[PDB]
């Protein structure tokens, strides 16, 4: 008559992720409909269909003067906790996890006078050297050149290239898996204005859209606040 | 609406855009609301020896309005089964009865 | 009956499955009357603060 069973040693323990609920103490509670639009099932979803300003210096944009040329314009170690990619949606989302596998996109919204032209260059430096510091060094890598004047912004896709199928959403001392490299933009042509008088500098917004192959795997509690 | 009252029977009015249901009344269902172990009564057990006071399960008395009392006296006649669950709050040092 | 009797009470309980009720009756207020024109105010989940 009575069934025969054996408790596992574990048995009367907790389990903070038991695939299966608990005892339904209140029942039959019918719930009212919801008419609110702008709903979501997936979080990656929102960061793909939405950019966020990267924080260069304390602002979300770099400058372009008619006295630049050689010098780098913008640089940062492509890892989801590198300075610039700190305040972004896409990067702040990440920290509920441990891993990402995606190439990112950036959009350069030039905001200088409508009598200003700046022309220009972006470059992705895979990890190896110790940060090229002149386009003449950087142009020998993957780069794109762009001429503001009629465009009114631009887009560059920093891909995913590495031996590991997933990388780290957390930066740390130089590993083959932390760093994916740098992202760089250069003054391929020092800015110009109707008068150097009226128009001193031009600027450019650096917006970060999640790439089209990007995804976060593995949820993880939050460490300490540092 | 003009009501010709006095003959018992209520009288309604019905507005415009009448309101849709939800919940389905359900939570007011007699059998349902009463199918749950309530804490009613509380006594003192017997010593094995001597003569007992046979306790009687008559839950049709009410008074302390613990929303189960009123509910039973909302009807005239009642027919239902029963199920019990005795528990036993220790009254002193819970280590004096080793059995 | 138990070797106890003292050193503890009980808390009986009832589960009334198949409850059938007949012949309604009036339902007893359970709360005093308030001050006319107004609301009665019991501290709830909701409430104000």
């Amino acid at each position: 008559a009575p069934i025969r069973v054996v408790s596992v040693p574990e048995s009367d323990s907790f389990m903070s992720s038991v695939p299966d609920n608990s005892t339904p103490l209140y029942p039959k509670v019918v719930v009212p409909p919801r008419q609110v639009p702008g709903r979501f099932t997936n979080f990656i979803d929102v960061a793909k269909q939405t950019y966020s300003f990267c924080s260069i210096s304390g602002k979300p944009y770099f400058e372009v003067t008619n006295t630049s040329g050689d010098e780098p314009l913008f640089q940062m170690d492509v890892s989801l906790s590198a300075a610039e990619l700190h305040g972004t949606y896409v990067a702040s989302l990440s920290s509920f996890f441990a891993q990402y596998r995606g190439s990112l996109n950036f959009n350069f919204i030039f905001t200088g006078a409508a009598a200003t032209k700046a022309k220009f260059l972006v470059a992705f430096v895979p990890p190896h050297s110790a940060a090229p510091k002149t386009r003449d060094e950087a142009m020998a890598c993957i780069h794109a050149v762009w001429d503001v004047g009629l465009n009114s912004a631009f887009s560059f896709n920093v891909p995913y290239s590495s031996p590991a199928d997933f990388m780290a959403v957390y930066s740390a001392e130089a590993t083959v898996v932390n760093v994916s490299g740098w992202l760089q933009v250069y003054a391929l042509t020092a800015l110009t204005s109707t008068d150097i008088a009226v128009n001193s500098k031009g600027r450019v917004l650096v917006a970060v859209s999640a790439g089209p192959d990007f995804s976060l795997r593995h949820p993880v509690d939050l460490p300490d606040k540092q | 609406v003009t009501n010709v009252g006095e003959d018992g029977e209520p009288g309604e009015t019905e507005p415009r855009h009448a309101l849709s249901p939800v919940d389905m009344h359900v939570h007011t269902d007699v059998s349902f609301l009463l199918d749950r172990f309530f804490d009613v009564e509380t006594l003192e057990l017997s010593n094995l020896t001597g003569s007992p006071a046979t306790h009687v399960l008559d839950p049709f008395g009410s008074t302390a309005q613990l929303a189960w009392a009123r509910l039973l006296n909302t009807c005239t006649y009642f027919f239902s089964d029963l199920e019990l669950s005795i528990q036993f709050k220790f009254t002193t040092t819970p280590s004096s009865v080793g059995e | 009956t138990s070797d106890a009797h003292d050193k503890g009470g009980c808390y009986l309980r009832y589960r009334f499955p198949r409850a059938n009720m007949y012949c309604p009756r009036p339902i007893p207020p359970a709360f005093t009357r308030p001050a006319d024109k107004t609301r009665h105010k019991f501290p709830t989940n909701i409430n104000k603060q």
């Binding site: - | 349902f32 199918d35 749950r36 | 499955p17």
Partner: peptide
Amino acid sequence: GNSGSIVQNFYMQQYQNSIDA
């Protein structure tokens, strides 16, 4: 009523409850 578990009929309804006619 409040018994929506698929184990309630472990004891068939004769032993479980009563019966009318």
